[PDB]
Design a protein around this ligand. Sequence first.
Ligand SMILES: Nc1ncnc2c1ncn2[C@@H]1O[C@H](COP(=O)(O)OP(=O)(O)CP(=O)(O)O)[C@@H](O)[C@H]1O
Length: 171
Amino acid sequence: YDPEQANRLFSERLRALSQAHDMLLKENWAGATIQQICATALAPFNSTFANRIHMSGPHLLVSDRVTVALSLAFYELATNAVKYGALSNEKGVINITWAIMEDKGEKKFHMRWAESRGPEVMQPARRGFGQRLLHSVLAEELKAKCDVEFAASGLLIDVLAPITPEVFPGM
Ligand SMILES: Nc1ncnc2c1ncn2[C@@H]1O[C@H](COP(=O)(O)OP(=O)(O)CP(=O)(O)O)[C@@H](O)[C@H]1O
């Protein structure tokens, strides 16, 4: 081991990641709706796994940063769904649902990624740096409380965010 080389490798890999994220940020300058984000990111998966990914929610416009964060989150979640969850078998299904909530006056954005009818989700299922990082980036861009549950019945991700015009333009 050499700590100086380990730090250098981490920076170089981080810079490579930032470069890839800027390519996405430039492309997505106008933002997008959850529907457009969701359908666009999950299009390669809808080809391979027809009628196994379901999306439902109101028409809702989101900023450039959230469109990028959410795209990679959706892509990364589907990548794992094929390797471990609902898309690893033949009967497993993914339900992406979002909506505009109300806490007796305060308007909130809620989103759920729900995997069902997939294989059993075995007890020591613990996230690595990448997914942890993506979830953290997504939650920070949304200024959201994010809950990740590795339920035996299937992975359940919940996002609860306050509505601000920075994150949700024209709101
Ligand atoms: N949709 C899903 N359904 C069931 N288990 C899942 C899952 N997504 C992830 N897991 C579990 O979480 C573990 C950790 O996954 P993660 O992708 O976070 O890190 P990793 O670094 O262990 C593998 P990799 O980075 O190659 O995907 C996986 O090994 C798997 O057991």
